[PDB]
Symmetry: D2
Subunit: 458 residues, 4 copies
Amino acid sequence: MNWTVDIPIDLPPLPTDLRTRLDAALAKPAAQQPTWPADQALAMRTVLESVPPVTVPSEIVRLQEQLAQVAKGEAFLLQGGDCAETFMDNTEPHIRGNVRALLQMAVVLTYGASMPVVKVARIAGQYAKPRSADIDALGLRSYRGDMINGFAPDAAAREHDPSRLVRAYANASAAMNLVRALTSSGLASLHLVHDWNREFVRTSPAGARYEALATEIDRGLRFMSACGVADRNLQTAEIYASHEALVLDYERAMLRLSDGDDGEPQLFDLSAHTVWIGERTRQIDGAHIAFAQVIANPVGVKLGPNMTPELAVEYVERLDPHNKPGRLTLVSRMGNHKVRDLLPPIVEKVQATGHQVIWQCDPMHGNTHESSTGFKTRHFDRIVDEVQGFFEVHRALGTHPGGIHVEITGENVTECLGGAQDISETDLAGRYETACDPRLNTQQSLELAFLVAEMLRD
Amino acid sequence: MNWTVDIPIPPLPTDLRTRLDAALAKPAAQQPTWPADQALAMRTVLESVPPVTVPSEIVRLQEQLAQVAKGEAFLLQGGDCAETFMDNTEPHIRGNVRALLQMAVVLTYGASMPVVKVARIAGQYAKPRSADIDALGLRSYRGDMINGFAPDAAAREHDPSRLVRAYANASAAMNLVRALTSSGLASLHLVHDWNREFVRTSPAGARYEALATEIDRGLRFMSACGVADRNLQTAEIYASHEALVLDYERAMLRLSDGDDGEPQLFDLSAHTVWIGERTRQIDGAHIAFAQVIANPVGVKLGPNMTPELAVEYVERLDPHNKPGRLTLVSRMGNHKVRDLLPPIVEKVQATGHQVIWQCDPMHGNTHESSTGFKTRHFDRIVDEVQGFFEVHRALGTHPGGIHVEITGENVTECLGGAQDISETDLAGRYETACDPRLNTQQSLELAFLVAEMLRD
Amino acid sequence: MNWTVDIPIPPLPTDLRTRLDAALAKPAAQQPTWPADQALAMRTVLESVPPVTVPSEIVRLQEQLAQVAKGEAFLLQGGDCAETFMDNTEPHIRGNVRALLQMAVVLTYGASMPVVKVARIAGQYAKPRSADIDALGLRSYRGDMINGFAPDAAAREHDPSRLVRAYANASAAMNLVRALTSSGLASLHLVHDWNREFVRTSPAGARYEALATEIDRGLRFMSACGVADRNLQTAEIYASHEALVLDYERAMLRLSDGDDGEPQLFDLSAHTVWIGERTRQIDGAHIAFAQVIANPVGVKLGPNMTPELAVEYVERLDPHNKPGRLTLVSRMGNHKVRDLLPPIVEKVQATGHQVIWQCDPMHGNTHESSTGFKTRHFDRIVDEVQGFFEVHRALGTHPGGIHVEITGENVTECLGGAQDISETDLAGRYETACDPRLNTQQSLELAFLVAEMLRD
Amino acid sequence: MNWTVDIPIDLPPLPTDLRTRLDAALAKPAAQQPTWPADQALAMRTVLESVPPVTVPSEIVRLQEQLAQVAKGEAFLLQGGDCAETFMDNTEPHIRGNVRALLQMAVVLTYGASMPVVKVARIAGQYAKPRSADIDALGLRSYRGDMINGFAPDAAAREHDPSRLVRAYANASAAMNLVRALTSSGLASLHLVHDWNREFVRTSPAGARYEALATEIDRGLRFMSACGVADRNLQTAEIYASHEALVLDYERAMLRLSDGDDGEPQLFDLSAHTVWIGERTRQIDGAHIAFAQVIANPVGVKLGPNMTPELAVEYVERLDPHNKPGRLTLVSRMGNHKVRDLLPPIVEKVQATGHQVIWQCDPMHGNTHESSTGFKTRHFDRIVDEVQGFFEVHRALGTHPGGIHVEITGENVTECLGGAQDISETDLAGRYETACDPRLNTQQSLELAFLVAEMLRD
Ligand SMILES: N[C@H](Cc1c[nH]c2ccccc12)C(=O)O
Ligand SMILES: N[C@H](Cc1c[nH]c2ccccc12)C(=O)O
Ligand SMILES: N[C@H](Cc1c[nH]c2ccccc12)C(=O)O
Ligand SMILES: N[C@H](Cc1c[nH]c2ccccc12)C(=O)O
Ligand SMILES: N[C@H](Cc1c[nH]c2ccccc12)C(=O)O
Ligand SMILES: N[C@H](Cc1c[nH]c2ccccc12)C(=O)O
Ligand SMILES: N[C@H](Cc1c[nH]c2ccccc12)C(=O)O
Ligand SMILES: N[C@H](Cc1c[nH]c2ccccc12)C(=O)O
Ligand SMILES: [Mn+2]
Ligand SMILES: [Mn+2]
Ligand SMILES: [Mn+2]
Ligand SMILES: [Mn+2]
């Protein structure tokens, strides 16, 4: 009839002082919010206020410690996953593939950087997106991600449905459960992950190019074993969860109070470990920035080509008022043709504040174009070149190129042009599967890690 | 108040399909009565969801249960009698995880060997009933996977959407159990501090002070010897429930890769499951389903168990003689266990198979109070574990573990303990959706008492 | 019966040469009387030999002694009163190492904190004498570094070749101590098994059974919690002796590299040394020598110690306020310790320096038996440690350690203990070349008793 | 007067059954023995029978386990030190230097081999040597090593002096004490040792040649740390002690019985962990081979160019009668011009026995010549080439090139020609300090390790 099933829905409030501060923050204007009825939103938030959290505060405190090391130039941040997760594709094979692809990158980057890599997935919550246009090319209300409405090009599917708040949480908690299982039970074994990398080198069209570094890494691993390193710390990995904090109904409902066995109680957003604010919602006096101000999680802000040095400093002063290294990550996405010019005066001005942000490169979102064959796509070479320029900016300034933020999948999709597979405009039509932006496929994402490893090694 | 999910629009190896079909074609007791087409829709949803557990965890559990079977570890299994969707919250889950960990510390010290920790959690949403009409003249409550606790006819109708609600709640609970155990709740030193606070405040804490202090001095000894808090920071808590609703269990089957031997069916709704008294028909679907899955399994054994039938369970469910694959869960009643258990243990031991012998001291010791509550006396619960130990000591066999129903809540559900919970007291916080649980103090007191059994 | 060694045919920093010269120019008590030119030849040999210890070990010991001084570890120091060349054998060295380890296990459990293990070994070859003529009318025996034990005049002549014989024996003993401690003698589980055998066979083993079993259950708990035998397989035993013969100690000085701060003189005849009652003249060469070397040092404090003099030792020997650099070693007599120690501890604590307070319960409790033997009563030895603990408990200060004279041999040298060694018994195996030692059973019994003091 | 000092000398016997077997073995003829009086030898043996052992049996059992792994192709044996230790040069700086030089080699070989390296020093007992001629070029009785007589060209010094048995033990136990201290207290820290290697690359004349591999190793080490390997297993190293078992008075006096907490009591030679029998004393029916037969230690036999395949098999049958992998090491020293020809039929015949020996290359003792300027010397290139040929023999046969046995020192001596320093015949006169054969100096020994690492990597 509909080919759906309906699932029926049937504790103490947050402290009054923290709620008072939250309410003053959320009184600010919020861009890009769903347009569902307030009373229905309230009902769904009330459901979510009672569910088990996706993450817990001690994990977020640990992440914060590891991100402080990144900010101080003593680790590197890898952040990667789908552009937009869908409920339909939130499956074991797909989750496992994206976790594998992230781990494979991390091995190569760890060796290249000669320092720890903090692994943060875009996963278990990346279900909401902004739109510039409220009507899409089919004359429909725009798809806004599965937390808000449906991808299917159908008017009914596109109506904003607050029950998707609860479907999002179910999907997020189920995905996170599996990410925890996979990372603690042997998928994330260093030797197993490297074996996958060896197979990539064996079969890639440009594997000859990456053979030398792959063999080095292999000889590094075998050296560890030769020296009598026990495989204990090598058996499991930590993968943290992240998404864009966009739908404030969801994020506010997933706020919890820490139990104060750590230093004192505060608000954590336990929908994720770390979240970032996007280019379309980072209004300095808007609700998203004010929400980020109130929560204890590490946070990031996207910085595009219109960014000024002065506005960047404002973000730093609002979001890192206590000068905690790693609390704030500034995520540059300029375009490969602009990054070398636009980034330096922003970095200089922010460095002069005495604060220590993480400088992270997003080489995807500034390098998107439309193909002749009608697909939204990005060229691999432009993605690579923005990271190259980003490294050059930091090397010239003596600052730390702190990490990358990429959109990838373990699927063999045909979404970005180029790479060693030499994906063409024609090829795009084969497996163009993204519900939003074009992702690096599993080979392209690994090839990028090898290339960035060589940047790190210089 | 509906959320809504879409019904999704590589085949099993032929032999596994054949064997699964044959198992599920056998008669199955205690199944919900809902329409086949609606059940199919829900199963098709569940066949696509992320699993609650993964096969490598289950293989690890099997290794650790083999050590139990060989007399080199002890099995602690505990949690709610029935999880509810309403009470599937962070505080409640944290409390039950804490209560299990607290027990495990005391039992680990008492046993002088590792304790395998298995929660009744993230799936324990279905129960059998002897009668389909209850004392109020309603269709019986069968757990939140099947129908609703509320005493009205509409709530008690069997609703297949509860299959998917059960999974949602299970996966969210399991996520949190993983987080809590890897991120410091399960720190050995933190858990023991809770035990010290119990001794401080219990009415019979004087009784348990000496052993508590011994444990404390054992922990400090580790630190004194330069043991780093690496192995001590985190714990493994496995998930278990009664495999009852075969619509749910069959939909949560996944095929392993052939990285370990050959491809097998794992039930990834849990790490380990057990078959109950009312569904363990030797030629029934539940026992046959258990034969087809790779998980470690248990079978409840009540007072009508024969030595010969016990051997037949062993031979059907442990056909490859894999130590720890099968757990036999005695629940006899404290007045019967000493008499009924020995000839069952003797006969099974003579097979050359190595089962885990596990004591369930709850389900054989239930009575109704004057004040109308289903309850159990603490002293009878303790005494069945005592008798169980005596049976094994006399035979030279391994008293392998306990299976108890507990909660971290301060409920008033079982009589007695050091709090001396009375029939009157029961009315205060009788919160269980099914059987009476040991509250958090009673569960810890039981662990101290069983530690003293282990030490003798 | 001579082996023969050749006299070997970068200058100190000027300030260290100046300070060493000034120290050694001060008056030195209790020195051998042998010709300067012969002493010089021997020192020149010793200036070229491989050191018994190395500076990084001494820096590590200093770190571990700082933890003792801060109340976070306990110091066990024990071995022969006087090592002899004749008894410097594998069995004897192994026995004394075993006896020290056995004590350390019990004390570690009792203290609930790490025990720093320091043997009187690999150098303890020289002793002071109050009288230069002994009861037989001979020149007194002064230890094998100086002259011979045999009661005849020729053997008692001071012989500087014994300097080099002492080093040879020391370095050979230290080699073996290193081998034994890294290669399984010092395995925690093996050492505890020896303790279990003692409880099995001692006449008062019933008395110590409960604590022995507690310790056993503590060890098994570690294993149960999945502690790997990595940290448990090996132990560190440091070497110590009284720094008495300044010809020997000065020849065994080596200059550190400047990898840790600046170059310093280390005495590499040992890890730590102490200055005795008869050589601790505040303006004498021994105290000045101790000021110049980087090793942790101790000073013996007897019944005539004032609080003011104790403070002067602290200020001279710990001028930089480095916790654990100085150990003050109380030896008062069991009848005096409670009275004499408190005002010394109070005054020193008020300085803001953190010394190690260590009990030597032997040297203040020596008497002569009817049957002619120098002996000590076990009960008086125990009682001085008891009083020492009482002094510290009353003051809120740290009873930091003990310094005892023990052997792994079944000798008959100290009266009493559970064996009830009598005056008659003494004649059986009175084997010490100087003071009466606790035998292997008495030394272990003492550790059990001091563990109970630690537990109160 | 003499410029010496005299040191005066002042327990249950070994079991009667073991002594009976020992006496039957030592009844055999023994070559190259000192000629001191029997009654004086007996007195000195009686002294030594009572001294603390240099090594203990549990260490030797552990070595045997690690050598079994070498024999099975899963580890590599490095054995190195002075040709002849002297008492005069048995000092802290010299011992420390030789330990450092061995460790430096081991790091490079571990990385190159991608498997553990068993580190065995020629040290703490290498005090005795054979001679072909009983009169030397000065018309004196030949120097036979400090255990027997004195190096000084003086008739009195050259008389065989049994008190040197006890001086040898004193020196051995003092050296071993220090080797234990150094290896457990931070000299043997992996990172510290590698830093020395970095400094060598910085300053060697051919450091450009070895820079790439040095940097690889550095990046391997930093990878370990990046992956969160704790520096516990990396802080200390095991260095075992070895010498040629030549003077049977010494070796027999240092026999001890194991305490039988291991499987059963037997005779261990506790003067060392492992000993070998030389080319001049390996008579198949001689006392040295029979002594090696009776002791439990791992043992080696030198095989020179006159070796037959049949005699090699005889050694295997006498010395490894229980087919214990690693118990026997066969140490080829052929000459670089002969090894490729002479070794293969020996390896083939021995492999066919079903026994697993360690095949170890001694590239020194077959490659010695006299310079025009009068010095006994070896060319670096010939030393390297014999190891090269040795590897080629094993690669062709599918057998395991199991290790090397070299004569090295941490001193900057001028004893072997060539290397990157290009040591000439003229240069030899500068620091020719060996009491017997020419050693690789500290730079040459490290350069050899780099070159053999490249052999391992092929
Ligand atoms: N693909 C998902 C299926 C899903 C994930 N978590 C839950 C929880 C409860 C029911 C279904 C699911 C979906 O379409 O939501
Ligand atoms: N486990 C040690 C690691 C090590 C420590 N120092 C060194 C020096 C050279 C090689 C290795 C090591 C080992 O592999 O022996
Ligand atoms: N206690 C839960 C609340 C809830 C609603 N949807 C989900 C999804 C996943 C976990 C929990 C929940 C209930 O009433 O079902
Ligand atoms: N880390 C060691 C543990 C140990 C090993 N053997 C012994 C013997 C006695 C006491 C302790 C130990 C240590 O704590 O010294
Ligand atoms: N007990 C020793 C035996 C001995 C003789 N020379 C040495 C050298 C090193 C150690 C011991 C010995 C003694 O009588 O001196
Ligand atoms: N390896 C863990 C140690 C541990 C950590 N937390 C707890 C709580 C209760 C018992 C033990 C542990 C283990 O033994 O399970
Ligand atoms: N160079 C050494 C010095 C030596 C080494 N060990 C001992 C023991 C006793 C006396 C001297 C030495 C030598 O010439 O023997
Ligand atoms: N301690 C882990 C090591 C590790 C395990 N799996 C992976 C995968 C990719 C990189 C590293 C690791 C860590 O460094 O995160
Ligand atoms: Mn995107
Ligand atoms: Mn129940
Ligand atoms: Mn004394
Ligand atoms: Mn040589």
